[PDB]
């Protein structure tokens, strides 16, 4: 409730504390990737780069809210997880 | 068996007038024979490790039972034909029934394959199945990269060395992409760095990294265990921005050597073509780009062959219905180049691959429709651009038709 | 962890700039969002308040607050220094709820809960040209739900128009192998609009909308 939200906690007053086949979404078939086509130019540490594995592997879309009423999962407040892989973090 | 068909086998015999329980007497006795050997028979593909009850293990059962294996011909004597089999007879429902006697001899014979030798692998490493190509396969945690760091040093040491330094090194790391089972889970990183090479290293026209790169193009499209449709809306334009560009370094010289990188990137682009096709996606998307690329007015001499090339290896029937109503088009645009009178620009060059090109693809998109009836000056209605050269690559092509 | 007096006065100060008091100063607090450069360590914190904000606009249908946060996000966008890769999975849905919801209005008939849809519309095609990686599918996921909201039967007119407008806003070669092999289905649209017996319902100003 007193962390990050907690404006919107307060205002709420809380107080607790075939044409869908796989293939035709690939975006080689639904992009102008002709545009890319250029004419006239005028380890100890893993090199390549770590990506947020909640974006890479969470399934983000059990968060859309598609009606709001009828809403098939209840949602719960989330918690400020501060992570650490991000560097521009002090901690 | 059906009894009608004991009918006629007796009445072509010279046994007539049989009744029908005399006919029916026929058909359960030679069903339980046929039904005594197939459970025979199958005794042999148990003890074979086949599961397939292929032709020869009749021929056993049969001599188990103390029958002649022969087929279609039975003797009397025996003697000269005992037990051994003749490997029954090579006959079809299909089949014409009169062959001639030289056809049979004129036939090249099948190759004898290779011999049985004995090769070992590892089914297990102290429990667990290798990927070789014997076998079938409040703060967050600090996460780790998906690649191992021995799969890190093998992409680090993939991509230096096909970046062509030398050429014995290339030619392993493009073979080790072309046949790597595990190079999955890998390919985001590989078609990243082909796709975001290609971009910067046409800023400045290095053919080099080009040729090396189409190169590793072809060889992740031929690795046969490897997803690649996911990643191929990335490749496409990789593959025919090579091909059509400008060149910002020599177009004079290394125009051969362009041409050959446009070679094996046409081979990139004919796997795009050929593989991963749907409905009206793929092919006519780079078609329609070709052909508005071709119909482009005052088009770059290097553009206008890289695309002259592209449209060329359609196949078939692309030339067929594309290249015919431009012929007249092709001629203008040689007869400017000549006029020049300067030839500093690459125009003149650009000018003479295009037309030798086209005329190439029009000498067999004639030899192929059309008899080679009037190869003087009949070409002269098509602007005479080949004319008798063409009629000379239209007779090859009919002497090579005749060595095949 | 905690965020310093200095930036927590910031936070309090730019989000209470744009809940609606005057325009100026909501102006003035989108064009600090945009435009500097140190604002990393509060954008979780823009990103917990914009999609909490988005979702008690099911408590309470404000179209206005709903503006104003996806001016909000549009703001966020335009931030050259900010890279919104680690909390686009929070910004996309309240994008989408305010794309796909049926309900977006207090007074369902006088509320250009329209525009709000043609926005946030633009919105998640400029979030998936500069997001969309072949690691993350966000187009094509995008495109699912999208799709999958606008051919299945029984959904409103809101969300038809929410996912059409999304569908359209993605680009040409989405409308040439998405919308056109439903165009039959303005036939269905037809059916209530030239013909009635109702007409003094709230289908037709949608469905024309729609059309």
Redesign the interface.
Request: hydrophobic share 55%; glycine share 4%.
């Given at each position: 409730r007193y962390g990050?939200?907690r404006?919107?906690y307060d205002?709420?007053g809380v107080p607790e504390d075939d044409?869908?086949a796989d293939?035709?979404?690939?975006?080689?078939?639904?992009?102008?990737?002709?545009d890319?086509?250029?004419?006239?130019?005028?380890?100890?540490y893993?090199?390549?780069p770590?990506?947020?594995?909640?974006?890479?592997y969470?399934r983000?879309?059990d968060?859309?809210?598609?009606?709001?009423?009828a809403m098939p999962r209840l949602?719960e407040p989330?918690?400020?997880?501060?992570?650490?892989?991000?560097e521009?973090?002090i901690? | 068996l059906p009894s009608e068909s004991m009918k006629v086998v007796a009445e072509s015999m010279g046994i007539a007038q049989i009744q029908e329980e005399t006919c029916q007497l026929l058909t359960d006795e030679v069903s339980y024979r046929i039904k005594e050997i197939a459970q025979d028979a199958l005794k042999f593909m148990h003890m074979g490790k086949r599961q397939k009850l292929t032709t020869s293990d009749i021929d056993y059962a049969l001599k188990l039972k103390n029958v002649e294996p022969l087929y279609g011909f039975h003797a009397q004597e025996f003697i000269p034909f005992r037990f051994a089999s003749g490997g029954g007879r090579e006959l079809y429902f299909y089949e014409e029934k009169e062959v001639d006697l030289s056809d049979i001899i004129n036939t090249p014979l099948p190759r004898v394959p290779l011999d049985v030798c004995l090769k070992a692998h590892w089914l297990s490493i102290e429990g667990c199945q290798p990927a070789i190509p014997e076998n079938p396969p409040r703060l967050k945690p600090r996460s780790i990269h998906e690649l191992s760091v021995e799969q890190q040093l093998y992409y680090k040491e993939i991509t230096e060395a096909c970046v062509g330094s030398c050429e014995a090194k290339r030619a392993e790391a493009l073979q080790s992409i072309a046949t790597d089972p595990g190079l999955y889970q890998m390919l985001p990183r590989f078609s990243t760095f082909i796709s975001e090479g290609v971009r910067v290293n046409v800023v400045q026209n290095n053919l080099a990294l080009l040729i090396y790169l189409m190169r590793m193009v072809k060889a992740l499209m031929d690795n046969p265990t490897l997803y690649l449709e996911k990643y191929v809306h990335e490749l496409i334009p990789a593959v025919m921005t090579c091909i059509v560009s400008r060149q910002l370094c020599l177009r004079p010289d290394v125009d051969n050597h362009w041409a050959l990188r446009d070679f094996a990137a046409r081979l990139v682009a004919q796997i795009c073509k050929h593989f991963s096709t749907t409905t009206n996606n793929i092919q006519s998307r780079i078609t329609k780009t070709f052909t508005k690329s071709w119909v482009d007015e005052k088009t770059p001499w290097t553009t206008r062959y890289g695309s002259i090339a592209g449209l060329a290896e359609l196949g078939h029937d692309v030339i067929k219905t594309l290249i015919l109503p431009r012929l007249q088009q092709e001629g203008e645009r040689i007869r400017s180049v000549l006029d020049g009178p300067v030839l500093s620009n690459i125009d003149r060059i650009g000018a003479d691959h295009v037309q030798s090109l086209l005329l190439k693809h029009c000498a067999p998109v004639l030899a192929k429709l059309r008899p080679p009836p009037d190869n003087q000056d009949a070409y002269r209605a098509e602007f005479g651009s080949l004319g008798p050269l063409l009629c000379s690559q239209v007779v090859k092509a009919r002497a090579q038709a005749a060595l095949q």
């Open positions: 990050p939200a404006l919107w205002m709420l044409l869908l293939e035709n979404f690939l975006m080689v078939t639904q992009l102008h990737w002709e890319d086509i250029i004419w006239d130019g005028e380890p100890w893993s090199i390549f770590i990506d947020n594995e909640d974006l890479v969470g983000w879309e968060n859309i809210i598609w009606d709001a009423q949602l989330p918690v400020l997880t501060l992570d650490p892989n991000d521009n973090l901690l | -």
